[PDB]
Amino acid sequence: HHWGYGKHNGPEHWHKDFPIAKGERQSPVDIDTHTAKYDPSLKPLSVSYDQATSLRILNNGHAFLVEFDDSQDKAVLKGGPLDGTYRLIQFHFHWGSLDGQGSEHTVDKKKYAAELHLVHWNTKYGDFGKAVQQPDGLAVLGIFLKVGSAKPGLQKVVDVLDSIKTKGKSADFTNFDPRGLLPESLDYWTYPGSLTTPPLLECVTWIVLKEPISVSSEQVLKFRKLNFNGEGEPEELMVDNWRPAQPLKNRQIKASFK
C-alpha cells in the first residue's frame, strides 16, 4: 500500500505523503513555445555515451528501469546549462493507455504518446543519494515519443519486457547502447524542476529535447502489457504512469534555439 497512478493513490493524493508535491519548482510543466526565451549563452549539449555499460532492466511497479554502471565516468552528460559532469544512472519511460496521452511534459498543451527520461547525477556529490538533496544534483534528459515508424534501437528493450511483466521482476540487460534512443537534433528547452515521482525532490535541471523520436504502434503496445501488480494478484495493466503538468510559478523556460 503506497503511491501509484490509480484513482485512490494517484498524483492528486501524493501531497499527503510528500508535501513537496505542492512545491515551488515541481515538474512536469507545459512548455509554452512562445513564452520560452532563447538564451544565446546556452552551450550545445555534450552527450558521451560511447562507453555506457547497462546492467539490468527492472519492473519496480511504477515503470521499468534500465540501470547502468555509474561507478566511473563511462556515460556522461555535460555542456548545455550544466556546470560539471553528470553520470547516467538509469532511464525509464512514462506512457499512456492510448496514443494521445502518456508524456509528462507537454508542448503548447500537446501531449505525446510517451516520454523517455535519462537520469544523470552530478559527480561532485559523489553518489546519487547525496545528489538528490542538492538543487543542482540531477540532470534529466527528456525525450518525447510519437507513434509512427519503428525505432530499431528500441527493439532490444521491447523484446525483453515479457521477462519482467510483474512488479519485482528483474533481468540481466547488458550491452545496450542508449545512443540509439536519441533524436537527430539536440536542440532543447531547459528549466529548474523536480523528480516527477515521489519523493518529488526539487533537485532536477530539466533538459527537454525539441525533436521527438518515432516508435511503432507495435512497440508502444508492448509497454502496455506490463503489470503494476506483482505476480499472483489482480492484474492491473501498467498504463498512464504519468503525472500531469504542474504550475510553472516563478520560473522561466529557456530555449537553446531561435
Catalytic center residues: 62
Q: Which residue has the cell 515503470?
A: 63
Q: Is 120 in the site for Zn ion (CB under 5 A)?
A: no
Residue 105 found at the interface with Zn ion (CB under 5 A): no
Smallest CA-to-CA distance from 230 within 158, 157, 170, 159 is with 170
Cβ-proximal residues to 229 (8 Å cutoff; 6+ apart), any chain: 61, 166, 167, 235, 236
Cα-based angle 217, 114, 118 (whole degrees, multiple of 5):
125
Count residues binding Zn ion (CB under 5 A): 1
Q: Which is nearer to Zn ion, 97 or 149 (CB)?
A: 97
Applying CB under 5 A, the span of 112-120, 127-135, 174-182, 216-224 interacting with Zn ion comes to 112-120
Q: Which residue is nearest to Zn ion (CB)?
A: 117
Q: Which residues contact 73 (CB under 8 A, 6 or more apart)?
A: 85, 87, 123
Whether residue 15 is annotated as binding a ligand: the answer is no
CA–CA distances in Å: residue 187 to residues 18, 44, 156, 170, 255 = 33, 8, 26, 34, 8
Q: How far is the CB of 102 from Zn ion (least distance, A)?
A: 12
Map the footprint of Zn ion across residues 44-73, applying CB under 5 A: none
Q: Are 26 and 246 in contact (CB under 8 A)?
A: yes
Rounded to a whole number of angstroms, the minimum distance from the CB of residue 81 to Zn ion is: 19
Query: CB under 5 A: which stretch of 65-73, 116-124, 145-153, 214-222 binds Zn ion?
Result: 116-124
To the nearest whole angstrom, how small is the minimum distance from the Cβ of residue 234 to Zn ion? 25
Query: Considering the complex, what minimum distance in angstroms separates the CB of residue 58 from Zn ion?
Result: 14
Judged by DSSP in three states, 62 sits in coil
- What is the Cα–Cα distance from 239 to 234, expressed in whole angstroms? 15
Q: Is residue 105 a known part of a binding site? A: no
CA atoms within 13 A on the CB side of 36: 22
**Nearest residue (CB) to Zn ion, 82 versus 141:** 141
All three cell numbers of 253: 523556460
Residue 243 found at the interface with Zn ion (CB under 5 A) = no
Q: Which stretch binds Zn ion (CB under 5 A): 22-30, 73-81, 110-118, 155-163?
A: 110-118
Distance CA(233)–CA(258), nearest Å, equals 51
**Residue 13 annotated as binding?**
no
Annotated binding-site residue? 2: no
Check whether 205 is labelled as a binding-site residue. Answer: no
Interface pick for Zn ion out of 25, 117, 120, 151 (rule CB under 5 A)? 117
Closest separation in Å from C-beta 37 to Zn ion: 25
Q: Does 25 bind Zn ion (CB under 5 A)?
A: no
3-state DSSP assignment of residue 235: coil
Q: Which residues bind Zn ion (CB under 5 A)?
A: 117
Please enumerate, by residue number, every residue annotated as part of a binding site for substrate: 196-197
Please enumerate, by residue number, every residue annotated as part of a binding site: 92, 94, 117, 196-197
